[PDB]
Amino acid sequence: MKYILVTGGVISGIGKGIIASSIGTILKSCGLRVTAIKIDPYINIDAGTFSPYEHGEVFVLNDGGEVDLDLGNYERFLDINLYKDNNITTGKIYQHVINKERRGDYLGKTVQVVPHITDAVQEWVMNQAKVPVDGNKEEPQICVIELGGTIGDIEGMPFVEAFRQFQFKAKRENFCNIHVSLVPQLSATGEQKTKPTQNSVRALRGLGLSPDLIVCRSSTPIEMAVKEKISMFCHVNPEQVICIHDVSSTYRVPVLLEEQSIVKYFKERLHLPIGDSASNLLFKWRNMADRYERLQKICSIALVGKYTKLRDCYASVFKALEHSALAINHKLNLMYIDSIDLEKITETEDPVKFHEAWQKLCKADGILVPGGFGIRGTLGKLQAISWARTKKIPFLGVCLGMQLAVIEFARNCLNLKDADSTEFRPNAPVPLVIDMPEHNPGNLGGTMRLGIRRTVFKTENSILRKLYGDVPFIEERHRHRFEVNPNLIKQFEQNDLSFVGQDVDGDRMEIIELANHPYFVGVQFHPEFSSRPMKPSPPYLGLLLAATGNLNAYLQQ
Amino acid sequence: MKYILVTGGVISGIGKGIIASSIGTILKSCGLRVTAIKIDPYINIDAGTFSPYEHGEVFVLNDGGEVDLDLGNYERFLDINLYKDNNITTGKIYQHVINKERRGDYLGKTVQVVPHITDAVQEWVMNQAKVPVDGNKEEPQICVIELGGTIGDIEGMPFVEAFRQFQFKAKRENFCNIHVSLVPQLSATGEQKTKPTQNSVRALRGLGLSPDLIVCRSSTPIEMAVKEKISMFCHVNPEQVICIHDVSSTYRVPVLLEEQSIVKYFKERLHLPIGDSASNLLFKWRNMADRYERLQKICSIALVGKYTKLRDCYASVFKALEHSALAINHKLNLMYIDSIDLEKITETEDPVKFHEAWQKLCKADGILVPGGFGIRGTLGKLQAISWARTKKIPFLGVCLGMQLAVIEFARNCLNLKDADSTEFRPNAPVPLVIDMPEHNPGNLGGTMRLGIRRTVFKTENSILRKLYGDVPFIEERHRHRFEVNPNLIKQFEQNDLSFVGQDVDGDRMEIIELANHPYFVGVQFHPEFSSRPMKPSPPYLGLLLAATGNLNAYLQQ
Amino acid sequence: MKYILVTGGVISGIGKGIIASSIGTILKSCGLRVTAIKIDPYINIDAGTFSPYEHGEVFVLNDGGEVDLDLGNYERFLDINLYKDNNITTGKIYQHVINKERRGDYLGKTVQVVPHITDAVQEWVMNQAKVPVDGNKEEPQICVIELGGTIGDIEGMPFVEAFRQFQFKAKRENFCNIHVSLVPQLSATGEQKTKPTQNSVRALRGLGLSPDLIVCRSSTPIEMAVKEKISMFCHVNPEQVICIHDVSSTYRVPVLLEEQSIVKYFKERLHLPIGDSASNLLFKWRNMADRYERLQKICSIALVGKYTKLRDCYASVFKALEHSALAINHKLNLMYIDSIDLEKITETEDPVKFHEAWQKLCKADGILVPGGFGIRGTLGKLQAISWARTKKIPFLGVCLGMQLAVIEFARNCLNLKDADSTEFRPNAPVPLVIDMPEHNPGNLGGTMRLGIRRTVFKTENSILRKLYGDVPFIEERHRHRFEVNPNLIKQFEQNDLSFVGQDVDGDRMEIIELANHPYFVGVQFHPEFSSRPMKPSPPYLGLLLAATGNLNAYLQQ
Ligand SMILES: Nc1ccn([C@@H]2O[C@H](COP(=O)(O)OP(=O)(O)OP(=O)(O)O)[C@@H](O)[C@H]2O)c(=O)n1
Ligand SMILES: Nc1ccn([C@@H]2O[C@H](COP(=O)(O)OP(=O)(O)OP(=O)(O)O)[C@@H](O)[C@H]2O)c(=O)n1
Ligand SMILES: Nc1ccn([C@@H]2O[C@H](COP(=O)(O)OP(=O)(O)OP(=O)(O)O)[C@@H](O)[C@H]2O)c(=O)n1
Ligand SMILES: Nc1ccn([C@@H]2O[C@H](COP(=O)(O)OP(=O)(O)OP(=O)(O)O)[C@@H](O)[C@H]2O)c(=O)n1
Ligand SMILES: Nc1ccn([C@@H]2O[C@H](COP(=O)(O)OP(=O)(O)OP(=O)(O)O)[C@@H](O)[C@H]2O)c(=O)n1
Ligand SMILES: Nc1ccn([C@@H]2O[C@H](COP(=O)(O)OP(=O)(O)OP(=O)(O)O)[C@@H](O)[C@H]2O)c(=O)n1
Ligand SMILES: [Mg+2]
Ligand SMILES: [Mg+2]
Ligand SMILES: [Mg+2]
Ligand SMILES: [Mg+2]
Ligand SMILES: [Mg+2]
Ligand SMILES: [Mg+2]
C-alpha cells in the first residue's frame, strides 16, 4: 500500500490538516481509492470528554465513534466515512499496549516504548490503511497520514520513531513524507526566511525521516530564491518545494497544489496507477472555489449557541451551512448568538449585551438552534425558537434545538406550560422530553444513541422527505440520551406541530415539521456530519433555500 | 567588568542590533560608561572589500578602520567612537590564530578550535572591553556584545563556545545573556506562537548558554499567556520576558525597553552602580521619539546615488539627514535617484526611467551628491550638480560629490572643458582631480586618506565655519585616494567657487563654498559618520536648514 | 570520480585512519588507482611547527610538504606519493578563503562559512582527487577521504556541511560514507552496547550525511544481535555493519575487512570496474600479516632519540625498522633511549636512569641515531655513536645522526677535537658541520633542503649502493638546513670514514660509510618516508641484516 505521512516543522498552526486533506482530494480526483489516518499525540482516547469551547466540536462517525473535528475535514474533502480507529491517539496506543501487557500477550518480556509502543503504531497503521472507507468494498490504494504537533515535541517522539521504522517495512516506492513548515517574513525587509525550515528539517533527519516534498506556509507566495535555498539545505529538488500562502478558501488549497504540480511528483515517487492525463476531477473543485470568490448576495442566519465564542464549537454546523450557501449561490453570514445573552434575566446585569443579541436575532433570514447538553443557554434558545415561530422566520432545530422545539410548542401552543425536559428539571410534573438510552445484549446498562441509525418517514407530506429525494427512509448520525416522551405524542395530533420521522423500532420520534410556516423543522440526528462540499445535507439546504426565499421554487424541479 | 551578550534565536533579521544598541543607550542614560563589541561571523577581516549594494555602507572609524555599518548604529545610539577591534570577525579571529601558529607562539602544540580559537575570542573580548571609548580616559563598566547569525549556525559555533567558557572567567554577577527570538503569529487565528523561542532556547542551552532576558520580536505586543509559557520552557521569570513589537522608530526601542523595566533587572543581575532613582537621561530619548511621530511638515531632498536601489548603501547618510530633519522639526523625504537614470544617453534605451529620474530631481528642496568611487554614475551626478547650481537649489557634495563640484565649475564656469578626474579618464589633458595618497615612515607605498584628520578653515567668511560654531578647525573622517590638483587652484581665485578648508600640511583643499547661492558646499570628509541623533553633523544641518529656508534665520542665534 | 568519506562517531581514537587506509589497500588490491585525502580540522596550515613529542613525527612528501604522520600511513598502505594538498586543514581552508577575500575574488560579496568555506572544501576535494598519485599518469578512480575529530565537534562542522552539499555534486553512485563508531562493553555483563553508535548516527543524519557502512570498533567481535540492532537504528543492512576488533597488527585490518566482505559492497554501491573475481592482491597482505604473527627470533636495536618518551616522535622510523624486520623474518625489539640519559652529567642527579640507559644500549644488536634539531640530546647521541664504533656494533645515522657521525670521527679519529656543529656552538673554532640552505630564483633568502633530491654515488665500493640494487643514484627525501663543511672534506681522505654519496651540484656530501666495520653508515636523507611494508628502505634493511648477522649472506644473491 502507498503511504503519505504529513508532518509539521516549525509551529503547530501552519495548516498540516488542510495540506493532508488537499493531497487526499487530489489523489481521490486522479481516480485512486484514498484512506486517511490522523495521529493526535494527546492522551484522550476519544473526543467524548471534550467541552466544545476547548479543542472544538465532537465529530460523530457512522460506527458511533466520538472523534476529533479534524477527522470531519477528511470526511468532507474526500467522499469517505471513517471508522473510529482512523483516529490514532497517544491515549489509544498506550492504552492498547498496557492492556496487552496485563493479559501477558508480550510473553513476560519488558514492554518498552521502542520496540513495543512503536510496533503498536505500525500494526495500527497497516491494519487501518487496509480497511475500505469509500462505498466500494475493495481495499484502499493510498493512505494519507497526518501527524499532529511539531517535530521535536516529546508527544510526537513515539510516532516519528514508528515512521522511521515504517519507511523500511513499507518499501521506498510505497512510503512518502510531506513536511509542512513556516517560512516567515517581517514587515520591514519583506524577506521570506528559510531558517526555521532548515532547523526543523535537520531535526526531522535526526529523528530519522527525510522530506520528499516541502510545503511552505507563508503570508505571500515564496520566491525562487527561497525554493532554491530550501532545496540546498533540505535534499529536495526546487520543484519539490511548494507553498500554500494564506488564501480566500480551503476549497482553493487543492487547486493551488495542482498548480504547484504535486500529481506529477506522486506519480513518479509512488509509481501510482494514475497514468499521464490532460484531466482529473479537480476541475469540479476548481469550479467550486471560483464560485466561492463570486458569492455576492448575502444570506444571513442566526445560530443560537451554547458557548461564549466560536473557536470551532460548531465547526461542521458552519461547514454544512457553507456547502448549502455555495449550492444556493449566496455568501453565508453566520450571526452567532451566545444563547444566554437572549435571556430576559441578563438585562438586570448587562443590558448592552442583551440588546446586542436581540438586534442580531432580529436581522435573521433564518434561525439555527444547534445541539448540545445541559441547562445552560436553554432558556435563551427557547426565546429564539419562539421568536422564529411567532415572527414567521425559517427554522432548523438540531438535536437539543428539536427537543426544545417540541417543548415550546407544548408550553406555548397546547398550553401544557408545566411541560419540561428531564436533563434539565429531572423532577418535571409532565416530562415531555425524557432519558431513553439504547440497550442491547452484550452491553452493561443503558448507552447513548450514537452513530448511524435508520430514521423512517411517517408520511409523504414532508418537506424534508422532498429535500431527501422522495426516499422512504434516511440513515443519519445521532448523539443523545434524551427523546420526546412517546406517551405524550397524543397531545400533538390535533395541532400544528407534526412528527414526520420515526425510529425503525417505532420507540422514538426523530423529525418534526410545523405546518402553516415557510420552513420549520427539527431533527434528532446531526445532518452536518453527513454533509459534503459537492452535495449539501438536505435539512441545511432547505433552511438556506427557505432563508433567501428559493424553497418554493426548488420543490418545482 | 560587566558583560551583556545579545544573541538571536530563530531567524537573523529580528533586530538584535537595535536591541543591543538600545540596551547600551539605556545603560549610558543611567550614567554608566558603556562600550560595545559586535561579532560578525563572516570571513571578511574588514568592510573595505564590500560593494555597497551587497551588505551595505562601509563605516569609517576615527582610527581609520573600514568597518560594518552596524558599528555605526552603536556610535549613533551611544555617544562613543569605536576602534576597529570592537568589530570581531571570523576572518579576524582565524587570521590572528593562524599568524600566532606561523610564528610558533603556540609552542609547537596542535592549534585547535577548542581551546585556541575560543581563547582568542575571550582574549579579544577582555582586551577590547577595557579600551576607553567615550571622551573620558577611565575604563568602561559594561560591554554590550552583539553576536551575529542565529544559534545553531555553523559560523556562530566558535563564538557561543567562547561565551560558554567566558561566563565562568567573568563571574555570574558580571556576565549576562539576552536572547532575542521570533514569536510569530498567523493571520487566521491571530495567536502568538512560543515554539521557535522554545526550540532556539533549548539549542542555546545545549551550546551551553542560558537566557537571562528573553526579548520577543513580534508583529504586536505579546500577551501574558505568551510571557508565562516562554517562562515555563526558558527558565526566566515572566517579568524577564520582554517584547519589542514593530514600531514607528528606532528612537522608540530604548523607550519601550524602559517601559518593559530592563533597568531594574540589570541593577539586580549585574549589581550595577545605578542606584534606585526616579530619573535617568532617557527622558531626552523619549522627547526625540515623541518629536519624530509629530513630524508633519515635509522637507524633501534628492540623493544622487551610485547604486540601483537602497538596501543600506547610504545608511548613515540617510541617518545624518534624519538627525538634521528632526532637529529642524521636518519629516525628511529622501528622493533617491539611481544616478545613471539622469544621463541623456539612457533616453535612447529606457526613456520612462529617464523622465522619472528628472521629475524626482525637479521636486527637490535640496540636493545631496554622496561619496563613491569609479566611472559609474559620475555623468548623471554631474547633470544633477549643474541642475543644483543653475536652478539655485541648496547643495551638499560629499567626497566624490565635492570632486565633481570642483570639476563642473571648471568645465561650465571657467570654460576649462577639457578638465576631468584621474580615477575616471586617467590620461586627462588637464587633470583637475588627481590621485594623491598619504605616505609615511613605516608604511609601504602610498595609502588612503582614511579615518580622522584635522581640516583647517582658510577664512572666517564660511557658512560651514558658522555651522561648526565659529571654531578655527574641525576633525572629521576621510576615505579617499583622490584630491583637487593643488597646482590648478589658481584658476579659481577670480571666480565664484571658493576653497574654505585645507589640510594641516596645506597639501590638500578639503572644503569648497559657491558664492551668490542659498547654500552650496562640498566637503572631502564624510560628516555623517560623526553625526548623532541628539546633535546633527553641521554640513547636513546646513543643507536641511537651507532646504526649508531656515538657514538665514538660524545664523541669527 | 568515486569518493569514500570516512567519519568518526563516538570518540576520536577509534582508528578512522587504519579503516580508511585499509579500505584504500583493499581497493588498490582490486586493481583501482586509489588516491587519499585527510582532513585535519586543526588550524595549523602545515606540520612544520610541531614539536614531535606533541602530536608526533613530521612527515615529508616528495614535493617538500611538511605534513601529518597520518599521511605517512596512507603512503605505506597504498603505493602512492602524496602532494601537500592531500592534507586539508582548517588552517589551509580558512587561509585560502581569507586570501581570496583580500584580493576581491569574491566580487565584494560577504564571504560566509556557508557557502564560501564549504565551497572551498569541495573545490579542494574535486581538484586534488583528480591529481595522479601513483606512478601512472592517468587520473585516480576512487578518492578515500578521512575526516578527523568526531561528529558534533565544532571543528568538523564546516567539513560535514561541505560533504552534505558534496554528495549531491558527486552523484549517489559516486559518493559513499563509512561511519566508524565505538561499541563499548563493560567487564561485569560483557554486553556490547550499540547506544553511542545510535546517538552519533542520529547526529550525523542531523548534520546531513547518512552511513553506507558502519564499522564498529570494539574490544571483541560484535555479535549478530549488535549487527541487527545497529541496522534497526542506522538504516544500513546487517551485512553493512562491520567490526574491527583490536588485533595483533595493522597489517591484519585490511584482511579482516575482506573477511567482512566490503569489496562486494563497494562493487554494488559505487558501480566499480572490479568485476566479480576469485582473487585480488590482498593475498600478499594476508601472507605478510600471517608472517608477522609467526615472528619468533628477536632482533633488538637501540634508538637514541631526542625525546622523553615515544608517543609517535619516530613513528615512520619505527615502521621502516618493522618492514625490514618482517622482510628478514625477525621480531623487532625497539630499545628506545631518551638520549640525555646517556650523558655522564646526569649521573650527578639521577644515576638510576643513567645506568638504565647504558644497560639498554649494551643489549643492542644494532644502533639507530635518528634525525632532529637543536643542542638537546646531542652529547648523549655522541656517546652512543662512539659506543657503536668502538664496540663494533652495526649502525645507521639519519640526518642529525649522520652529522654527529662526521663530527665524532673528526673529534675521536682525526684528533680534530675543537671540531663542532654550527646549529649547536655557532661560534665553532673549526666548523665541521655548517648552515648551508638551498637558494633559488623566485625565493626570498635561504630555505631548507626539503623534499625529494637526487643523491649520486661516488664509488661502486658502497654497501648502500649494493642494497639499492647497484643503481647509479637514488632519489630520497631531505629535511635540514645543515651539512658537512665541503672545505673540511680533505681531512677525511687518509682515514677510515669515506663519503660515498653526493648532491648533483657537488656542493653537499650526503652519505658516509666507515670501513673495517660490519655496517656503519650515515645518510642526510630520511629513508623511512620512502619505506613500504612490501619493500623495505635499503639503509634500514642493511641495518637489520647486519644486526642479526645476515648482511654478508644477503650480498651473495
Ligand atoms: N480539510 C480541511 C482542513 C482544514 N479546514 C479548515 O481549516 C481550519 C484548520 O486548519 P488545519 O489545516 O487543520 O491547520 P490548523 O488546525 O491551523 O493547524 P494544524 O497544522 O495543527 O492542523 C479549520 O477551522 C477548518 O475549517 C477545512 O475546512 N477542511
Ligand atoms: N548551517 C548553517 C547555515 C548557514 N549559516 C550561516 O548563515 C548565514 C546567513 O544567515 P541567514 O540569512 O540568517 O540564513 P539564510 O540561510 O539566508 O536563511 P534565511 O532564508 O532564513 O535567511 C551565513 O553567514 C552562513 O554562514 C551557518 O552558520 N550555518
Ligand atoms: N542602533 C541601531 C540599530 C538598528 N538601526 C536600524 O535598524 C536596521 C537594522 O536593524 P537591526 O537592529 O540591525 O536588526 P537587523 O539588521 O534587521 O537583523 P540583525 O538581528 O541581524 O541585526 C538598520 O536599517 C538601521 O537603520 C538603527 O538605526 N540603529
Ligand atoms: N517539549 C514539548 C513541549 C510541548 N509539547 C506538546 O506541545 C503541544 C502543544 O502544541 P503547540 O501549541 O504547538 O505548543 P505550545 O507549547 O502551545 O507553543 P506555541 O505557543 O508555539 O503554541 C502539547 O500537546 C504538548 O504535549 C511536546 O510534545 N513537547
Ligand atoms: N594506515 C595506518 C593507520 C594506522 N597505523 C597505526 O595506527 C596508529 C594510529 O591509528 P589510527 O588508525 O590513526 O587511529 P587513531 O590515530 O587511534 O585515532 P583516529 O581515529 O583519530 O585516527 C598509529 O600509531 C600507526 O602506527 C598504521 O600503521 N597504518
Ligand atoms: N530512541 C530510543 C531507543 C531506545 N529507547 C529505549 O531504550 C531502552 C533500552 O535501553 P538500552 O539497552 O540502553 O538501549 P539498546 O537500544 O538496547 O542499546 P544498547 O545496545 O546500547 O543497549 C528501551 O526501553 C527503549 O524504550 C528509547 O527510549 N529511545
Ligand atoms: Mg488540524
Ligand atoms: Mg538570509
Ligand atoms: Mg544588524
Ligand atoms: Mg499553542
Ligand atoms: Mg589518525
Ligand atoms: Mg541494551
Query: Do C10 and C64 reside in the same domain of the chain?
Result: yes
In sequence order, which residues have a C-beta less than 8 Å from that of residue C3 and are 6 or more positions away?
Answer: C125, C129, C142, C143, C145, C166, C170, C174, C175, C176
DSSP state letter for A113: I
Q: What distance in angstroms lies between residue A155's CA and the mean position of ligand 4's atoms?
A: 8
Ligand 11 is an ion; residues with CB less than 5 A from it: C 17, 70
Evaluate whether B301 touches B368 at the Cβ level (below 8 Å).
yes
Query: Do A250 and A204 reside in the same domain of the chain?
Result: yes
In sequence order, which residues have a C-beta less than 8 Å from that of residue A155 and are 6 or more positions away?
Answer: A41, A42, A90, A149
CA dist list (Å): C107 to B94, C100, C101, C102: 21, 10, 9, 11
Query: Do A101 and A175 reside in the same domain of the chain?
Result: yes
**Residue B132: CB within 6 Å of ligand 3?**
no
Backbone phi, psi, residue C369, to 5°:
-105, 105
Question: Which residues of A form the catalytic set?
Answer: 399, 526, 528
Q: What is the CATH number of the domain that holds A397?
A: 3.40.50.880
Collapsing DSSP to helix, strand or coil, A289 comes out as: helix
Evaluate whether C423 touches C482 at the Cβ level (below 8 Å).
yes
Are C205 and A206 in contact (CB < 8 Å)? yes
C89: contact with B, CB 8 A cutoff: no
Burial degree of B1 (CB within 10 A; 0-12, 13-18, 19+): middle
Collapsing DSSP to helix, strand or coil, B357 comes out as: helix
- Assess whether B528 carries a catalytic annotation: yes
Q: What count of Cα atoms within 13 Å lies in the side-chain half-sphere of residue C62? A: 13
Query: Do B355 and B463 reside in the same domain of the chain?
Result: yes
Residues of A in contact with C205 (CB under 8 A): 205-206, 208
Query: Do B477 and B546 reside in the same domain of the chain?
Result: yes
Q: Which of B367, B359, B369 is nearest to B305 (CA)?
A: B369
Q: What distance in angstroms lies between residue C244's CA and the mean position of ligand 6's atoms?
A: 23
B55, B161, B399, B517: the active-site residue: B399
Q: Which of A303, A540, A520, A545 is nearest to A392 (CA)?
A: A520
Instruction: Out of C165, C206, C232, name the one closest to residue A202 (CB).
Output: C206
Containing A129, the helix (H) or strand (E) segment is: helix A118-129
Parallel, antiparallel or unpaired: strands A2-8 and A175-182: parallel
- Ligand (nearest to CA of C315): 5
How many Å apart are CA C73 and CA C68, to the nearest integer? Answer: 10
Evaluate whether B239 touches B231 at the Cβ level (below 8 Å).
no
Query: Do A346 and A249 reside in the same domain of the chain?
Result: no
Are C235 and A165 in contact (CB < 8 Å)? no
Query: Do C278 and C367 reside in the same domain of the chain?
Result: no
Instruction: Out of C205, C207, C208, name the one closest to residue A208 (CB).
Output: C205
DSSP-derived secondary structure for B398-444: ETHHHHHHHHHHHHHHS--TTEE-SSSSTT-SEESEEE--B--TTS-
Residues 200 through 239 of chain C touching chain A, CB cutoff 8 Å = 202-203, 205-208, 232, 235
- Ligand (nearest to CA of B7): 3
How many Å apart are CA B291 and CA B289, to the nearest integer? Answer: 5
**How far is B53 from chain C, CA to nearest CA, in Å?**
9
- CA-closest residue to ligand 2 atom 14: A195
Burial C178-206 (b: 16+ CB within 10 A, else e): bbbbbbbeeeeeeebbbeebbbbbbbbbb
Please say which residue of C275, C291, C307 terminates a domain: C291
**How far is A187 from chain B, CA to nearest CA, in Å?**
8
Q: What is the CATH number of the domain that holds C38?
A: 3.40.50.300
Are B44 and C101 in contact (CB < 8 Å)? yes
Best residue among A43, A153, A159 to mutate for probing ligand 4's pocket (most ligand atoms within 8 Å of CB) is A153
How many structural domains does chain A have?
Answer: 2
In sequence order, which residues have a C-beta less than 8 Å from that of residue B487 and are 6 or more positions away?
Answer: none
Collapsing DSSP to helix, strand or coil, A331 comes out as: strand
How many Å apart are CA A163 and CA A183, to the nearest integer? Answer: 25
Query: Do C313 and C178 reside in the same domain of the chain?
Result: no
CA angle, B259 then B261 then B263, to 5°: 120
Residues of C in contact with B111 (CB under 8 A): 42-44, 91
In sequence order, which residues have a C-beta less than 8 Å from that of residue A235 and are 6 or more positions away?
Answer: A210, A211, C168, C208
User: Inter-axis angle of helices C90-103 and B90-103, to 10 degrees?
Assistant: 120
Instruction: List chains touching C (3+ CB pairs under 8 A).
Output: A, B
How many Å apart are CA C249 and CA C21, to the nearest integer? Answer: 13
* For chain B, counts of helices (H) and of strands (E): 17, 22
How many Å apart are CA C221 and CA C293, to the nearest integer? Answer: 19
Instruction: Out of B184, B191, B246, name the one closest to residue A184 (CB).
Output: B184
Alpha helices in B221-281, H assignment, sequence order: 224-234, 253-259, 262-269
DSSP-derived secondary structure for A448-487: -EEEEEEEEES-S--HHHHHTTS-SEEEEEEEESEEE-GG
Please say which residue of A272, A291, A310 terminates a domain: A291
Evaluate whether A478 touches A527 at the Cβ level (below 8 Å).
no
**How far is C100 from chain A, CA to nearest CA, in Å?**
24
**Residue B532: CB within 6 Å of ligand 3?**
no
**How far is B58 from chain C, CA to nearest CA, in Å?**
11
Q: Which of A485, A336, A370 is nearest to A423 (CA)?
A: A485
Evaluate whether B162 touches B175 at the Cβ level (below 8 Å).
no
How many Å apart are CA B226 and CA A216, to the nearest integer? Answer: 25
CA angle, A242 then A247 then A252, to 5°: 75
Atom of ligand 5 nearest to the CA of C16: 20
How many Å apart are CA C384 and CA C16, to the nearest integer? Answer: 38
- Ligand (nearest to CA of A225): 2
Query: Do A143 and A182 reside in the same domain of the chain?
Result: yes
How many Å apart are CA B140 and CA B81, to the nearest integer? Answer: 13
Query: Do C257 and C328 reside in the same domain of the chain?
Result: no
Query: Do C420 and C507 reside in the same domain of the chain?
Result: yes
Query: Do C122 and C177 reside in the same domain of the chain?
Result: yes
**CA–centroid distance for A67 within its chain:** 9
CA angle, A555 then A524 then A529, to 5°: 75
Please say which residue of B256, B291, B326 terminates a domain: B291
Atom of ligand 2 nearest to the CA of B156: 28
3-state secondary structure labels for all residues of A194-207: CHHHHHHHHHHHHH
Q: Give the N- to C-terminal CA distance of chain C in Å, as an integer.
A: 44
Backbone phi, psi, residue C440, to 5°:
-145, 155
Domain encompassing residue B458: 292-555
Residues of B in contact with A199 (CB under 8 A): 152, 199
Per the structure block, which three cell numbers stand in for C365? 644488536
Evaluate whether C301 touches C331 at the Cβ level (below 8 Å).
no
Per the structure block, which three cell numbers stand in for A296? 455576492
Q: B541's torsion region: left (phi>0), alpha (psi -120 to 50) or beta?
A: alpha
